[PDB]
Write a protein that binds this ligand. Structure first.
Ligand code: NAI
Ligand code: NAI
Ligand code: ZN
Ligand code: ZN
Ligand code: ZN
Ligand code: ZN
Lengths: 379, 379
């Protein structure tokens, strides 16, 4: 309130160099411009997407930078022409937006907003190409339009979802990424029917969300596939009924799955980012009616490759961005499902650290087995 | 009737050598065994599938052989345990079957019958591995279980569709292949909505069937693509609204289409058999909601290849066998649509010759621009 229209002085975790530990710095946060809001961050988290651009290996090295794109916060002030958000609103900043004006935003199927779709190299604000962060007079790059590793951040209002103000902001700060992506990959894109079989490649947060969606859809068999056998017991909490490590088999995994299911699974969801797993996820679905959904992001420019007859045998291949959920229209409904005990969120939380110890979240992530770490603001 | 249970002596067009002209021979046709029927052929036609296996380039050279898989005929007699067909029934023998007992035959989506799905190398009958054709005591290979280039042929009853006995058998003899495949590729698999745009790659019989389906679906723009500009005027009779030759453009055809439609077509149907056209058909559909359907059969084992991000941008890739139509359950309904003036068939007929001049049908086919040639039995 007293900060409305004013520059805020607060702390942010700044990445000065690729792959080096973040530094808690005193920064200045400009007030929000047209169509922007300024958000007090209460909880944030870390995922491989932040780590990938912080490591900047084979990536355009934008530094200094404030990473972070999964957070729960409260609106502090709104910029010109913002009417759907007001101070005090509980919100999730999300790495992609919904302008409400383009053909995608008017569609049933697509969340590929022409204005506000994710952009990993945009270092400033959409309104004016400027940064809202400075340190000692010098600007700092934004990340995904969210930059949630700060006590306050400025975000285009199209990337800010208003949610149930009774929702606990530490549990929902992780609906902005992997959970909703896998949940919607199964429910919106794969669309299994009751009793069907589903194979999930990758049992990180995305695959676990896909498993929850497959249980909500009523799948009778949910086969979780992962090179990492440590992730199996964890996965069974999220709906996975059988676990398969490819390392334990001489046969290719798509043959292993087809043999388990008499021709292949009804649905598959690829949640690894490995192009080889995308091929395998496609080839492991049944002929005639099988549907595979690609979710993982490939690191290189290897191409998906398969014999065309695999399609002529009546397989279908789909792909998803953020579970095909619209961030402003649909994500609040995801939170509502959590509030109505229809969706599991607490079991994603494997770690927690205060903001001053944010670098430990990188350690837990890079060591493996960390699903999400709740980074608590204030100390 | 008088021929029931007897060997029939009749004429067939026999291929003795790869790529050499057929010879009209006096053959013997055995009576039908269990689950088989013997059919008097009144009209048959020729398509590239017959030519491909008659040329036998890179193909297993089964000779001598009776080709032919598009025909209209009348049941002469039925074998043991046949109850859905009786003598006098008007029928279409079809290159693939419907046993009615497997999971595909109980499905909504799939026509991939486990027992009777198409098999290009099967030279004998399913019942006993034997040929029902002999010439001077020596057997002749069957083709696709149909072998319609004979005055009489024996076919598994699962591959024989009973149709409206008032349907003209010369017009419907071409519903057994390209027409129904493209029609169902659009209506059953691509599923455009009213007002949407559809790009069709290849304007042979398959692409023309896809165009008819796109008009029935109410597509506002139907863009026909083909290297052969002679096929354009023809295509407009079948629903194509715009024609594009790739040769006339420096830009890749998928870019040409995207530029015509502001991001890409809503639906595409690939009806060429060229793997490069399958890639192009996929990449030319709009992001967010585009759906491409593969129909053409590739000659080699080149693989379909695309950047995985094309799917993550929410494109869908499907494939079809015979338009996903079940041959015994659905094909009679296709004929009914012709009988109710809802489907154009006469305009597929570009040529006609008597059976003794069947080799001319090969000439008209190999020269190009022939859609279908009605081969009339009896002289
Ligand atoms: N499509 C979208 O909109 C989104 C895509 N993603 C992508 O989804 C993927 C999954 O993300 P997270 O779950 O956070 O990642 P993660 O790294 O936590 O989980 C990946 C899991 O897959 C396993 N794995 C890797 N290669 C494998 C292979 N060849 N076969 C079997 N298992 C394999 C790993 O052991 C690990 O358990 C990533 O590529 C991420 O970039 C993430 C969020 C949004
Ligand atoms: N999926 C299925 O169940 C079925 C598949 N097919 C396949 O469908 C395809 C089409 O069959 P028809 O219409 O009878 O063949 P067709 O040879 O009469 O027509 C193909 C057309 O595509 C054109 N074309 C070829 N390469 C092209 C390219 N790269 N770009 C643009 N145009 C190109 C040709 O000029 C020709 O007009 C064939 O591959 C056939 O084997 C046929 C029937 C059943
Ligand atoms: Zn938009
Ligand atoms: Zn994330
Ligand atoms: Zn069957
Ligand atoms: Zn044919």
């Amino acid at each position: 309130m007293s900060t409305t229209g004013q520059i805020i002085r607060c702390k942010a975790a700044v990445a000065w160099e690729a792959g080096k530990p973040l530094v808690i710095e005193e920064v200045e946060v400009a007030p929000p411009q047209k169509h922007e809001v300024r958000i007090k961050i209460l909880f944030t988290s870390l995922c491989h997407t932040d780590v990938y651009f912080w490591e900047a290996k084979g990536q355009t090295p934008l530094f200094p930078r404030i990473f972070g794109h999964e957070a729960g916060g409260i609106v502090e002030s709104v910029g010109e022409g913002v009417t759907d958000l007001q101070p005090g609103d509980h919100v999730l900043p999300i790495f992609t937006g919904e302008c409400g004006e383009c053909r995608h935003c008017h569609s049933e199927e697509s969340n590929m907003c022409d204005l506000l779709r994710i952009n990993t190299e945009r270092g400033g604000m959409i309104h004016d190409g400027e940064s809202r962060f400075s340190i000692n007079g010098k600007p700092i790059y934004h990340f995904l339009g969210t930059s949630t590793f700060s006590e306050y951040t400025v975000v285009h209002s199209g990337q800010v979802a208003k949610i149930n103000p009774d929702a606990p902001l530490d549990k929902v700060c992780i609906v902005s990424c992997g959970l909703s992506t896998g949940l919607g990959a199964t429910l919106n894109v794969a669309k299994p029917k009751k009793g069907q079989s589903v194979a999930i490649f990758g049992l990180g947060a995305v695959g676990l969300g896909a498993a929850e969606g497959a249980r909500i859809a009523g799948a009778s068999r949910i086969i979780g596939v992962d090179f990492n056998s440590k992730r199996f017991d964890q996965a069974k909490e999220f709906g996975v009924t059988e676990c398969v490590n490819p390392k334990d088999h001489d046969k290719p995994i798509q043959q292993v799955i087809a043999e388990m299911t008499d021709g292949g699974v009804d649905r598959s969801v690829e949640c690894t980012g490995s192009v080889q797993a995308m091929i395998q996820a496609f080839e492991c679905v049944h002929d005639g009616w099988g549907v595979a959904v690609l979710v993982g992001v490939p690191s290189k420019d290897d191409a998906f490759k398969t014999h065309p007859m695999n399609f002529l045998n009546e397989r279908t291949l789909k792909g998803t961005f953020f579970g095909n959920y619209k961030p402003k229209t649909d994500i609040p409904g995801v939170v509502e499902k959590y509030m109505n005990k229809e969706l599991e969120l607490e079991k994603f939380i494997t770690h927690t650290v205060p903001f001053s110890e944010i670098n430990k979240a990188f350690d837990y992530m890079l060591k493996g087995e960390s699903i999400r770490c709740i980074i608590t603001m204030g100390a």
